[PDB]
Amino acid sequence: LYFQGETHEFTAEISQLMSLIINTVYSNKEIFLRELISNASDALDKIRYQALSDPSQLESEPELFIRIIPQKDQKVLEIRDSGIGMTKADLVNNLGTIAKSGTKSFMEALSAGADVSMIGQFGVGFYSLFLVADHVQVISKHNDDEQYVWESNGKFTVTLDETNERLGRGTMLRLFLKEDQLEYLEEKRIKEVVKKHSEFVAYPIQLVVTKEVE
Numbered sequence: 001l002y003f004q005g006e007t008h009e010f011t012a013e014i015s016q017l018m019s020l021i022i023n024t025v026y027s028n029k030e031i032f033l034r035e036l037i038s039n040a041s042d043a044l045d046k047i048r049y050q051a052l053s054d055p056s057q058l059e060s061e062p063e064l065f066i067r068i069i070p071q072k073d074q075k076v077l078e079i080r081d082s083g084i085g086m087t088k089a090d091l092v093n094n095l096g097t098i099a100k101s102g103t104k105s106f107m108e109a110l111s112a113g114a115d116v117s118m119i120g121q122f123g124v125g126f127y128s129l130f131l132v133a134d135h136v137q138v139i140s141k142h143n144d145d146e147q148y149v150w151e152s153n154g155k156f157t158v159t160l161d162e163t164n165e166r167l168g169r170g171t172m173l174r175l176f177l178k179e180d181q182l183e184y185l186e187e188k189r190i191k192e193v194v195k196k197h198s199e200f201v202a203y204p205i206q207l208v209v210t211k212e213v214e
């Protein structure tokens, strides 16, 4: 169903090319944020749905939200949602994996100069993160599993989370931004991008800003 079956061994070189392709094809780099919000919206839909039959699934994190937390000190942009979350197996599948179907369609679409604006539907959207970031940490907690951290920059690694604060449920993406892409820690820019590709989202998109007072 996906490239290299599922397993990812001695294939760091591929991540560079996909990153190089996506960095060359997508000159408007703000679309990484649109894909994050779209991923988070889908995650919230799934837990809301399965909470209709079994409302006890919402007790881990009662509220359903998307939250963007720019960390100016650490040069990190954090995007958290309270969706269904990801087990260890789910993290390995969704993160860093390529689908032969999507890539073949993506590559072929590039050949004919066809509309590739919607990156998510080629199963390749993961590497849009590397448009703005040099490293990525994914913290996730699924009701049926413990909290795990997936991170790469590349070598993939899923580590049991024994340090970060506890998420009730859901996923947090920590983006270590490139030195030229720090514009995405600023409030104005974030609202600009969110306002663009977020009209149709049914969940609140919250922005946490720390400003000094005069």
Ligand SMILES: COc1ccc(CO/N=C2/C=C/C=C\[C@H]3O[C@@H]3C[C@@H](C)OC(=O)c3c(O)cc(O)cc3C2)cc1
Residues within 6 Å of the ligand: 032, 035, 036, 037, 038, 039, 040, 042, 043, 044, 046, 081, 083, 084, 085, 086, 090, 094, 095, 096, 124, 125, 126, 127, 128, 129, 170, 171, 173
């Ligand atoms: C910035 O661009 C990209 C980042 C990562 C990827 C590859 O990970 N793909 C994802 C798929 C999301 C689509 C539907 C989901 O409801 C299912 C729950 C679970 C499977 O998904 C998530 O928890 C989740 C999230 O809450 C939040 C996320 O940001 C991602 C993801 C994980 C692709 C693009």
